[PDB]
Symmetry: D2
Subunit: 115 residues, 4 copies
């Protein structure tokens, strides 16, 4: 599991469950090509987005549908979505946990890069 | 004026100075069209990006070039930038302060939205 | 002046208004002795807590009563307060902005430290 | 495991390893009585602080020795330590994950309260 997304809800103090997450890889013409997606689990986690072989070096965007999340909770969100854009190495894998802490008008994202 | 970007460096406890900030507005159309850009001042603030009249309803993207910031300080950061995307002025003109707090492997962004 | 506390509400995207803030300084002695206190204004800022001369070297504790803030908005928050503890003026007088960004189950605090 | 502490390093994008954490419970005379402590593991986590029976309702302080952490990494920290003070319920357990994201001049703490 080279890429994992964990999303937390700072309002409810809970995993952010059922948050849509899209992953894009930057194509040669600089467009975002869809790569992977899923919804965060009961634990606010999204595993199995990619595999080591598929998760090559490149620029990746993780788009977290924070707006729909806040919408479902009846809370006015500010952001359309939380985007995390990063280069996957050099030098090598490396597992990536993209942690997002969500509030209606604020989010943080943190990369926990291990091995 | 109606849009300000304030950037802090969570490593130094300082304004993040000379941080490039690009603002885009989503067109008809769905493409991001260049709206405004600037750099943060010595206070980490970027003022004067737009005017109440120019800053109409829309979906705006504020792209903060955090990577160049960190790289100019010798740090290979995780993120390419900090991008903040939001609908502005949906229920009337507001002032938006887009705050980013930067760490090499983390940023937060906070919107402070006021009336006018 | 040398110490300012700025509090934001990450749920509303607003200054956190009327937030009680208590500042303590560690005495000789190891006890926290009451240094200053105040409430945040409509800008979420608390100015005038101290003066350069009063704000000497020390370990300071800024206790932000986030609980009362959230509870006055109907929310049972997680934290009792946001407490920021730091050594001030170790290498000379500085200006300290203590920023807190509040969510019912999370806060961040950021120090912006400048010269003078 | 009713109380868990997870600490992340926003500078290195890594678990904050070997971070001293003290847990205090507020005594009747409002003093902080030491309750539990440990050091975050390789995964930036600290488990086994307490048990359901011992982790009664009360006001608890989790003190995270962020300063020594930054000291060991040769980075000037601002804070003496990250303190998290909270009431353990009502109404009941409930597992508490106290997540702290650390930077030299900023930290966030988030409570992930489940069940």
């Amino acid at each position: 599991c080279p890429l994992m997304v964990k999303v937390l809800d700072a309002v409810r103090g809970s995993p952010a469950i059922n948050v849509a997450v899209h992953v894009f890889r930057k194509a040669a013409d600089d467009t975002w090509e869809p790569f992977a997606s899923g919804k965060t689990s009961e634990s606010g986690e999204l595993h199995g987005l990619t595999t080591e072989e598929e998760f090559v070096e490149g620029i990746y965007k993780v788009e977290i549908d924070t707006k729909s999340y806040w919408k479902a909770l009846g809370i006015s969100p500010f952001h359309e979505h939380a985007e995390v854009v990063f280069t996957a190495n050099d030098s090598g894998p490396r597992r990536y946990t993209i942690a997002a802490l969500l509030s209606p008008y604020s989010y943080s994202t943190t990369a926990v890069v291990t091995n």
